[PDB]
Design a protein around this ligand. Structure first.
Ligand SMILES: NC(=O)C1=CN([C@@H]2O[C@H](COP(=O)(O)OP(=O)(O)OC[C@H]3O[C@@H](n4cnc5c(N)ncnc54)[C@H](OP(=O)(O)O)[C@@H]3O)[C@@H](O)[C@H]2O)C=CC1
Ligand SMILES: NC(=O)C1=CN([C@@H]2O[C@H](COP(=O)(O)OP(=O)(O)OC[C@H]3O[C@@H](n4cnc5c(N)ncnc54)[C@H](OP(=O)(O)O)[C@@H]3O)[C@@H](O)[C@H]2O)C=CC1
Ligand SMILES: CN(C)S(=O)(=O)c1cccc(NC(=O)c2nn(Cc3ccccc3)c(=O)c3ccccc23)c1
Ligand SMILES: CN(C)S(=O)(=O)c1cccc(NC(=O)c2nn(Cc3ccccc3)c(=O)c3ccccc23)c1
Lengths: 388, 390
């Protein structure tokens, strides 16, 4: 008998990831989990036919039901408008979704013990979370002004006085509200993983701009989170970007990195500040190149791990909201069986290339896209059997 | 006898690199080159005793004599202030020097055939270059933040909305860049590509900051088409622009052998500051003073510290010195020393950091590497042999 997963918003996408997405649902999710599924087709053809209305509806459904899992989508350009005869150059669905929900995007590289990283010392993964420009034609003043909405005196800052020749200039901003949300998402993400949190800035150069980030982070930590943080042996603390880069390379991993300023193993999750609404997806795109080969009837070897972890992160958050222990265990089992299958030597060509070097990869070093999905399916069914 | 190397500004540093620096001069430089040497002690204790005056004097010496070679130095923090009982937290000597000199910083990792790279496809080195002032402020509450340009001839006024704060306050910031500094960054990059016979790539994000980064691309190609394309085709190299997103992807898939102008083991990494005048250069290792190896040395333990990046700081400085003086003997020595350093490693003689790169630290044994003095002696023997056979 299957697990009652509850309410989940699902978004179908394009090209190669759309194929893999269906394989994930039919081979790894649906055989074990029943969902109250709010499905929205964000494939490029259906967004065009609905005048992108489906994208707004899917975002609204995430706001209402708190859990969304999204397949990679085509962001249109001139060639895409030509390829599909689009009515418009529709805005990227992720841009539309982020504006409606807000929050912070956190990305995490899944680590397999037999797949090399940048540094071998990285044993645990980490989670990293994250303008008006114009040309100055010639000599003149560039100023940035603040006009208070209550009529009090305007304030003018000289950006630069070009006395000989021109150049460029730009202005940037950040609302307090968005810094607060950034902090709230970062604290809640660190708690949800039991990991310490670091915020990096350059508040020594940008003493007012980056200083506002460092200040607001400490204020919200001290009042709302410091007591829950050591209640879980963790902490939060601010670094200058120079210190944190050095600390991260000498580190083993397992920390959240709020940064102010192989693709098949990159996850993304949009964490809203309320701690309730999350949207998970792969950090890569629709893999058009493999999709062309798939269209010509040729063999593909596309890495589905990042797409699988979109589902597992969403289902893990759903289970946390609903206190669904069976679903929470299932989400973990699906992640572990994914890592273990690769660590046992069964992987797609991209990962085999990371080990042997692309010029020396042979066909017997990897599985094609369909062979790998079947290997995961068989291993998943064995694992869940051994858990009863 | 010995080569007359001419005028060279030398800066001594701190901790383990200070030791390696003397070993390099004693065993590799002085036995073969006589120098009109302008030596400055940028050790932390001397910087404190002179109130950092030695750092400014060394920067001016590099301006005067056009060639500077610098050992790594301690940049003080709070614990350093207590360790040495410093009068104050002195600014990093590298920032001081960079501010007096200006220019473009080029970095390059030394490639050895038997030492793993991050990507196996990398078999030739690359050089990444960056050019060496914003007004940020607090937005106390709701209101309009605009940025405005008024040309000095008064014929117009352009106002751009940065953001209309409506429910609260926040922060805002204006930043600029001059054409002149973009031109310095272009000229240094084009000339560096010619000096090595490598193609040059510029990378920006002009898909988002289409005016800010677009002017970078514009100025590079104008300078290229009107001043450098003939020399690039004669050496059959080229220059192209790339969006940073695809340049990163292309770079991981490449073999190397190009200069990468960027808009945005450590013992094998060099850094060279090329000043706008095209004539003044300062070279140094891209790593620090290796404090923890120094602590091992202090307690009598054997150390195995990589001197390659420090050696190449000397060779780059000596090579540029020889180029300014048309000194064919000094130019031959500089290149010979670089060859000896790479050949020695490729022959299987290396310090522990490189052996760990190959085999992984848990599998390293003492017979897999040489200690700091053994490696320097091995380079000494091979340098003596190499020069004699000429
Ligand atoms: N979140 C989203 O919705 C995103 C969507 N896109 C969209 O995707 C489309 C194509 O973009 P593109 O530039 O190709 O970006 P992709 O992320 O699709 O990059 C594809 C390239 O990276 C490698 N790669 C990426 N994912 C995988 C994987 N899962 N398994 C194996 N290899 C992988 C492949 O390299 P190789 O060819 O060497 O095998 C492939 O050619 C565009 O229309 C774009 O709008 C792009 C980014 C994000
Ligand atoms: N150019 C300059 O003037 C710079 C100076 N510094 C200064 O140096 C001091 C210490 O800096 P730190 O943070 O230790 O960074 P370092 O670059 O001095 O060393 C950090 C680590 O990198 C490895 N390493 C670096 N260089 C070598 C080498 N030549 N051979 C073998 N291994 C090497 C060692 O790793 P392992 O321990 O694993 O062997 C070392 O512990 C600081 O006071 C800082 O101010 C820092 C940066 C630049
Ligand atoms: C790319 N820029 C130059 S940077 O963003 O400024 C920068 C600078 C320096 C270091 C890092 N990287 C990490 O600290 C890091 N990275 N990964 C992969 C990873 C990538 C993106 C998002 C999540 C994970 C890990 O798996 C890991 C594991 C243990 C410990 C650290 C790490 C990034
Ligand atoms: C912060 N960012 C992540 S990024 O610095 O912009 C970035 C992005 C992507 C790739 C690279 N790196 C390389 O393409 C590269 N790197 N090294 C090491 C090296 C380090 C410093 C200076 C010179 C060389 C090589 O030796 C090499 C050799 C052959 C071909 C390529 C390479 C950098």
């Amino acid at each position: 008998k299957k697990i009652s997963g509850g309410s989940v918003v699902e978004m179908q996408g394009d090209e190669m990831t759309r194929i893999i997405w269906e394989l994930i649902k039919e081979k790894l999710i649906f055989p074990y989990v029943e969902l109250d599924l709010h499905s929205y087709d964000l494939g490029i053809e259906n967004r065009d036919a609905t005048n992108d209305q489906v994208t707004k509806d899917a975002a609204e459904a995430i706001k209402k039901h708190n859990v969304g899992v999204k397949c990679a989508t085509i962001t249109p350009d001139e060639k895409r408008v030509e390829e599909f005869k689009l009515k418009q150059m529709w805005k990227s669905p992720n841009g539309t979704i982020r504006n409606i929900l807000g929050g912070t995007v956190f990305r995490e590289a899944i680590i397999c013990k037999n797949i090399p990283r940048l540094v071998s010392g990285w044993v645990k993964p980490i989670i990293i979370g994250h303008a008006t420009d114009f040309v100055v034609p010639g000599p003149g003043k560039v100023e940035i002004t603040y006009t208070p909405s209550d009529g009090t005196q305007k304030v003018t800052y000289l950006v630069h006085n070009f006395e000989e020749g021109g150049g460029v200039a730009m202005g940037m901003y950040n609302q307090d509200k968005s810094i607060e949300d950034f902090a709230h998402s970062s604290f809640q993400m660190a708690l949800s993983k039991g990991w310490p949190l670091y915020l990096s800035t350059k508040n020594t150069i940008l003493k007012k701009y980056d200083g506002r980030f460092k200040d607001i982070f400490q204020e919200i930590y001290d009042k709302q989170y410091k007591s829950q943080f050591e209640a879980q042996k963790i902490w939060y603390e601010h670094r200058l970007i120079d210190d944190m880069v050095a600390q991260a390379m000498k580190s083993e991993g397992g920390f959240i990195w709020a940064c102010k300023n192989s693709l098949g193993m990159m996850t993304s999750v949009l964490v809203c500040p309320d701690g309730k609404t999350v949207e998970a997806e792969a950090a890569h795109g629709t893999v058009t190149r493999h999709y062309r080969m798939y269209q010509k009837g040729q063999e593909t070897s596309t890495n589905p791990i990042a797409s699988i972890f979109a589902w597992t992160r969403g289902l893990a958050h759903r289970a946390k909201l609903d206190n669904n222990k069976e679903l929470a265990f299932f989400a973990n089992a699906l992640e572990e069986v994914s890592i273990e299958t690769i660590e046992a030597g069964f992987m797609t060509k991209d990962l085999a290339a990371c080990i042997k070097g692309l010029p020396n990869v042979q066909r017997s070093d990897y599985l094609n896209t369909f062979e790998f999905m079947d290997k995961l399916g068989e291993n998943l069914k064995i694992k869940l059997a051994q858990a009863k």
